[PDB]
Amino acid sequence: SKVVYVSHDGTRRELDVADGVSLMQAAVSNGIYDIVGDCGGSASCATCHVYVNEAFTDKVPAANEREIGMLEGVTAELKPNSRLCCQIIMTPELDGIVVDVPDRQW
Ligand code: FES
């Protein structure tokens, strides 16, 4: 299923991501270096911060309490569409989801 990662400079990278893989796992394993994923995906670090495109923000499962506690500490601007992408699990229904990657994670 297609996921489009748009870097801060505007370059769009479309990856095909298998069911059940987090957007963070697909990013880090494919050289999307602007997503760090330091804690390994347990919503313990805030370094997989992305901005979910408005056409998909309400299409993905809501942020649980742990993700909310960690989003508080993102280093780039926190926005209404900020999410930790290790919390976004790919499904066929999300095909085409676009996320914009901030210019910093640390
Ligand atoms: S990889 Fe650590 S919060 Fe997402």
CA–CA separation, 38 vs 59, rounded Å? Answer: 26
CA–CA separation, 26 vs 43, rounded Å? Answer: 16
Read off the CATH number of the domain in which 84 is found: 3.10.20.30
Q: Residue 27: CB within 6 Å of ligand 1?
A: no
**Which residues does residue 97 pair with via DSSP β-bridges, in sequence order?**
3
Was 85 annotated as part of a binding site?
A: no
What is the bridge-based pairing of β-strands 97-100 and 2-6? parallel
CA–CA separation, 106 vs 74, rounded Å? Answer: 8
Mutate which of 32, 68, 86, 99 to test ligand 1's pocket (most atoms within 8 Å of Cβ)? 86
Was 86 annotated as part of a binding site?
A: yes
Domains held by the chain: number? 1
Parent domain of 57 = 1-106
Residue labelled with tokens 């699990």: 89
CB 94 within 8 A of CB 57: no
